[PDB]
Design a protein around this ligand. Structure first.
Ligand code: AQZ
Length: 334
């Protein structure tokens, strides 16, 4: 039970172990505030997030428990991982604040831009490697986009969720609930990201859900008979057939002058039918990534138990489950 010190910044009490020194605000919003800090135990530079009113409602409490469970399980080089979690509460009774600690990321993908073909290969490779890992434990990101990707000076990437319109990167089946989905909603997003790096521009910059679909269908074409057969909703089916029939464009006439193996991968990623879309694992083995792919260093995750998600609990039960998870936390080795 280490020594805590208090201090105020951004109009909020921070109460942290002495281990963590020199705190400096880096951004706050509805969900939590974040500080950079020096970690006197590893000489490393870290980021500390104070959750905003984590047990105010049933939604907040369950969400707080979800983030903590998730970060405790993720142990992979291309995925954010949990260095430490603490509370200044001595007991469950007085337990009201949660703090999460991770490696301090510098600049996101949004900030670091066009760019070389070798750079795109390496950046997209690392995202897929990280996606193979989380998808293997049935975890879906759902909000993959450049501002959720951290990239340091070595060009090393990590997937995270700081919590660019999201809709610009969203799979059309999730955006509209028009057809069932799987893990490959995130594969759609990656294709939108890769295109952007290849050409310097947002691929599909829609101004609402309808305009977004319009732009997308302009590129991939209206759904064929095969895909139209699996659209569950009657409304959605009508809309689509009531549109004016757009053809599939030739991707080489769109990504003009780009590396042909990347044009090919883009075509396997940006397919409308989600039964046909390439997975993370299959995509690691494509010829675009020949210089990086090693099937013996692209690991999968331990089984992840997410049954809690179907439960309807009271606030005090989620709060108590969170506290347990704080107490059983064992740090990762140096
Ligand atoms: C310099 O600005 C920084 C740096 C940071 N470094 C490290 N961590 C953080 N933020 C952070 C995030 C989290 N949680 C998650 O990342 C999270 C939650 C849920 N799910 C995931 N997954 C889903 C599947 O894939 C794995 C990821 C991740 C926990 C603790 C911390 C500390 C930051 C934050 C940061 O700045 C934030 C504000 N800033 C203002 C300028 C732009 C953004």
């Amino acid at each position: 039970r280490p020594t805590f010190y208090r201090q105020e910044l951004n109009k909020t009490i921070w109460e942290v172990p002495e281990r963590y020194q020199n705190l400096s605000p880096v951004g706050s919003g509805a969900y939590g505030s974040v500080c950079a800090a020096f970690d006197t135990k590893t000489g490393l530079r870290v980021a500390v997030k104070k959750l905003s009113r984590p047990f105010q409602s049933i939604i907040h409490a369950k969400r707080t428990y979800r983030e903590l469970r998730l970060l405790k399980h993720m142990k992979h080089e291309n995925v954010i991982g949990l260095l430490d979690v603490f509370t200044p509460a001595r007991s469950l009774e007085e337990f009201n604040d949660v703090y999460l600690v991770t490696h301090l990321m510098g600049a996101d993908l949004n900030n670091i831009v066009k760019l070389t073909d070798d750079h795109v290969q390496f950046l997209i490779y690392q995202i897929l490697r990280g996606l193979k890992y989380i998808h293997s434990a049935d975890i879906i990101h759902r909000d993959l986009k450049p501002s959720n990707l951290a990239v340091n000076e070595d060009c090393e990437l990590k997937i995270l969720d700081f919590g660019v319109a999201t809709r610009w990167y969203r799979a059309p089946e999730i955006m509209l609930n028009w057809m069932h989905y799987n893990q490959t909603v995130d594969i759609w997003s990656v294709g939108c990201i890769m295109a952007e790096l290849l050409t310097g521009r947002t691929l599909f910059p829609g101004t609402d859900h309808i305009d977004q679909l319009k732009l997308i269908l302009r590129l991939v074409g209206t759904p064929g008979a095969e895909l139209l057969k699996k659209i569950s909703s009657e409304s959605a089916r009508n809309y689509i057939q009531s549109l004016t029939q757009m053809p599939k464009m030739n991707f080489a006439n769109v990504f003009i002058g780009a590396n042909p193996l990347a044009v090919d991968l883009l075509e396997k990623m940006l397919v409308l039918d989600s039964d046909k879309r390439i997975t993370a694992a299959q995509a690691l083995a494509h010829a675009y990534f020949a210089q990086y792919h090693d099937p013996d260093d692209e690991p999968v995750a331990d089984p992840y138990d997410q049954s809690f998600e179907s439960r309807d609990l009271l606030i005090d039960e989620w709060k108590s489950l969170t506290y347990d998870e704080v107490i059983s936390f064992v740090p990762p080795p140096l």
